[PDB]
Amino acid sequence: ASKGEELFTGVVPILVELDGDVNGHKFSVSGEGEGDATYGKLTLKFICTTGKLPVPWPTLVTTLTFGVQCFSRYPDHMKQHDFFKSAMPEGYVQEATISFKDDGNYKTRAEVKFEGDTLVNRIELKGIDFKEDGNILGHKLEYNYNSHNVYITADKQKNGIKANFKIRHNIEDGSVQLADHYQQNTPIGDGPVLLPDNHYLSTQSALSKDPNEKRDHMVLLEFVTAAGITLY
Ligand SMILES: [Mg+2]
Hints:
- The two termini are 24 Å apart.
- It is built from two helices and eleven strands, in the order E-E-E-H-H-E-E-E-E-E-E-E-E.
- The chain has a single domain (1-232), classed as Green Fluorescent Protein (Beta Barrel), CATH 2.40.155.10.
- It has helices spanning 61-65, 83-86, and strands spanning 12-22, 25-36, 41-48, 92-100, 105-115, 118-128, 148-155, 160-170, 176-187, 199-208, 217-227.
- 4% of the residues lie in helices and 49% in strands.
- By secondary structure, the protein is mainly beta.
- Strand 4 (92-100) and strand 5 (105-115) form a beta hairpin.
- The chain has an eleven-stranded mixed β-barrel with strand order 1-2-3-11-10-7-8-9-4-5-6.
- The longest helix has 5 residues, at 61-65.
- Bound molecules: magnesium ion (MG).
- It is classed as luminescent protein.
- Keywords: fluorophore, luminescent protein.
């Protein structure tokens, strides 16, 4: 267990700021909400502040929530495996490559750290090689998000962690759009961090709309629980 974990015993306010460019379609997203790691619970509202989002909202969920993996519920018996909180408050840098099968890719860079008592995530996203009337730029994905695992492994070399997982977005015709994810996280601070044994994050997400919101937006309720390492 770590000193960073003490920062997460109660409800913590969250800010997310994203600048994106996908095939030259530029956009920004701002998110606000809060996290309660005791319950692995996230409540966030994201708004496209530049007009219409040029990609489907579900394709941004992992990018927008990458940095809030510090709100995962680690069972007590697994708390020595929680890198994310151990890096706080100084934070970490995160990079990911998200490869959409038979389409383009996102590359992201982000920094997550505390700013006072708020957990702040700042993200840059670059997407290239998308098909103009593919499932992403053609907006052919359902507004939903399947439950999934995020497989974590240590990168001791680099004093950090990696994650690998596949997302299966639902296409409106009943098919699936696969998105391969590779994530790397590195501490910003010089203090010690927890380098975990292999384990995963079990994630469940519900996407909705604010009925009074006329801007392009996404309301997200997400639960994230660590598992995979195991008295009666
Ligand atoms: Mg369907």
